[PDB]
Amino acid sequence: SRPRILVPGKINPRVLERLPEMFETVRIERADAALVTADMRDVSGIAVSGKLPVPLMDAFPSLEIVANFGVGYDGVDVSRAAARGIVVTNTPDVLTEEVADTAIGLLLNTLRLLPQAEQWLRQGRWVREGAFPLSPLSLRGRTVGLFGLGRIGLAIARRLEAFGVSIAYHTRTPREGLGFTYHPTLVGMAEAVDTLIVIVPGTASTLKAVNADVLSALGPKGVLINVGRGSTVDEAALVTALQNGTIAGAGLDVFENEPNVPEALLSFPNVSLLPHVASASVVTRNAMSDLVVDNLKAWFSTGEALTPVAETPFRRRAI
Amino acid sequence: RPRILVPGKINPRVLERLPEMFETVRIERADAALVTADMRDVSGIAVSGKLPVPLMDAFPSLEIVANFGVGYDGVDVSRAAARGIVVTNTPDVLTEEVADTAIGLLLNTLRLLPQAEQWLRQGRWVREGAFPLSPLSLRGRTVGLFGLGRIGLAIARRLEAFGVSIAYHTRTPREGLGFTYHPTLVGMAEAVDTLIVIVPGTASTLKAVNADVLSALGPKGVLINVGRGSTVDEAALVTALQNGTIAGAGLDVFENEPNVPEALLSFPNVSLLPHVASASVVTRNAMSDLVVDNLKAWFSTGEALTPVAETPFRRRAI
Numbered sequence A: 001s002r003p004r005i006l007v008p009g010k011i012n013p014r015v016l017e018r019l020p021e022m023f024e025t026v027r028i029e030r031a032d033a034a035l036v037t038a039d040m041r042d043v044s045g046i047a048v049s050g051k052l053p054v055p056l057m058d059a060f061p062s063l064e065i066v067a068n069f070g071v072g073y074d075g076v077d078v079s080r081a082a083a084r085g086i087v088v089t090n091t092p093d094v095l096t097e098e099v100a101d102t103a104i105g106l107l108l109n110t111l112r113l114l115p116q117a118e119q120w121l122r123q124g125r126w127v128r129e130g131a132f133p134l135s136p137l138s139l140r141g142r143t144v145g146l147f148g149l150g151r152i153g154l155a156i157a158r159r160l161e162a163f164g165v166s167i168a169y170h171t172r173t174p175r176e177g178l179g180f181t182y183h184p185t186l187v188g189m190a191e192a193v194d195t196l197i198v199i200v201p202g203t204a205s206t207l208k209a210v211n212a213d214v215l216s217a218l219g220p221k222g223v224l225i226n227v228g229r230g231s232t233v234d235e236a237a238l239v240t241a242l243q244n245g246t247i248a249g250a251g252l253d254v255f256e257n258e259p260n261v262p263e264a265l266l267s268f269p270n271v272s273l274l275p276h277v278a279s280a281s282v283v284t285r286n287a288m289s290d291l292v293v294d295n296l297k298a299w300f301s302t303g304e305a306l307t308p309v310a311e312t313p314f315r316r317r318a319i
Numbered sequence B: 001r002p003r004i005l006v007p008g009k010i011n012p013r014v015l016e017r018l019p020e021m022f023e024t025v026r027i028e029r030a031d032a033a034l035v036t037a038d039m040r041d042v043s044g045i046a047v048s049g050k051l052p053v054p055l056m057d058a059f060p061s062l063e064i065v066a067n068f069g070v071g072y073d074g075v076d077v078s079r080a081a082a083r084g085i086v087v088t089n090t091p092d093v094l095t096e097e098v099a100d101t102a103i104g105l106l107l108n109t110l111r112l113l114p115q116a117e118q119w120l121r122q123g124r125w126v127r128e129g130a131f132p133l134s135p136l137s138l139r140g141r142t143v144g145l146f147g148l149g150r151i152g153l154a155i156a157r158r159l160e161a162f163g164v165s166i167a168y169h170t171r172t173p174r175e176g177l178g179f180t181y182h183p184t185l186v187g188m189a190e191a192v193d194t195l196i197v198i199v200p201g202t203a204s205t206l207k208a209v210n211a212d213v214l215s216a217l218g219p220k221g222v223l224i225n226v227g228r229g230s231t232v233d234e235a236a237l238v239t240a241l242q243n244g245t246i247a248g249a250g251l252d253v254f255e256n257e258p259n260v261p262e263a264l265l266s267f268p269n270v271s272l273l274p275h276v277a278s279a280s281v282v283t284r285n286a287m288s289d290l291v292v293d294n295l296k297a298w299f300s301t302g303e304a305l306t307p308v309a310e311t312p313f314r315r316r317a318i
Ligand SMILES: NC(=O)c1ccc[n+]([C@@H]2O[C@H](COP(=O)([O-])OP(=O)(O)OC[C@H]3O[C@@H](n4cnc5c(N)ncnc54)[C@H](OP(=O)(O)O)[C@@H]3O)[C@@H](O)[C@H]2O)c1
Pocket: A071, A072, A073, A092, A093, A095, A099, A147, A148, A149, A150, A151, A152, A153, A170, A171, A172, A173, A174, A199, A200, A201, A202, A205, A206, A227, A228, A229, A253, A254, A276, A277, A278, A279
């Protein structure tokens, strides 16, 4: 009858609310193949946030589609999905402006120490000790390099244009038409700028791209902001750079092994840390939920997904 | 050399540069009781915050008050004008800094970023999972600026890039801009869901953001105050927040700094800052420079750099 969709582990309840429009939902408490039972072998689709282990994906012989919750889909083995003729979809565009907003807020919090200033006030220190100390850093006069200048990178750049800072970017291919300075290497951009915003996907090509050399080039007024994926930053090298004063500060929304954050990173008074919140408003998460479900609905009703990923430009063949 | 009184705390850069032309007289607080007989020849004051009239009037030869800050409501400018005393402020050098902070405060209010960071730092990510989704967002908002001066315009320029509708209220419209003018504050409040306060703290703005304005702002309403605390009816705001009349607030300034009402500290939908909008090293250094350069210009040329509107004065010396 109706296609059966597996939802492994946690997902926004709006996905679960709307799947009954067309589907039966099969739930397992974590993304683990050991929890797959014999009566689940007819599942035809997955809706998932985060990791989809290959053994779990491969437990389903009739699987046609993985609808990833999020624009980043590095938790899905897209190479393996493609090899099996399985379409993978993501949630681009509906979160672009939200994530760009968060990126700017994180940058300002990192530079001006706004969260720290609020803690000073809330702990009664304004009354008892007087003004919060002046922030050594400011956005004024900074030069910002965007590592990534895609949907979200461009949206961040557009915001930054209005703040009166210089904007440069690094990507594998330049985007002609824009009036921003292209750098063909990450390290060369880092040299040239004092503020590096990371907004690339977490792929093999970006793994630990922000390394000791890049951090050294960024320099002693350097501020690193990561709103992409944790894997793109060498977290150990960042902790070392911060400890040595190789750079001035950092703002991070994403980490190597979420929800674990290394103890050393928590120590620094010149670092802002967020628990992967860049898209995490009710409105934007509702829109992401809608796009996951609408991808599944489009696939099963029309054979054409709404937002398939680049690696799987597929159309449904019904078997 | 002219003698300059500096009452209470001020950026040390002011104190460092005064010796370029002046003798400095320091008192520990802005209090007339600390004025001694040998201070009666003072010709200028450099001050941050309040300058009580009894202190200002302890100096028969006073010519100039150089206010640290673009806001100068702590100086009784009417009294200064009556005495032929020029008052200067520090516009422009802090405009972009303050606009930056305003945007950061707005985003922190809407997205709860400081609370999300506390969730992480307190170990709750691990044991309790994701930080709750923020009920609010900037997406789809309509922002009304109360004030569209040096700083208000700079805020509006930033907001243009965030894809929100922009409106403003001032006593006189600024032609040439493509923003919607509202001739009344309450009418703007009706029309918008986000109100950014960036007017001076004058008689005309005292408690302008009152119960009616907050009610018009509405149940999705967010109030951001980066102007002066006096402009918001703080008691009415607490009531509005408590009742859900509005959705949230971000405040850098308060009625009776550094005191913040305990009720405001209770709300999970409020961001509070201890008057930090200009408080970077670079911007405070520029402000300090402008205070001193105003005094130097006055005594050397007879023309201040940035006198306030109420005192368009030129020096008369014998
Ligand atoms: N923190 C959060 O909550 C959050 C939320 C949403 C998204 N994200 C992350 O942000 C990422 C970007 O999203 P998006 O929508 O902007 O994606 P997108 O439109 O595909 O942009 C990706 C950008 O990265 C560049 N890039 C990719 N690989 C590169 C490499 N090896 N070296 C240099 N540049 C490289 C791309 O240009 P080239 O192909 O020319 O190199 C492109 O400019 C997502 O993949 C996700 O991981 C995080």
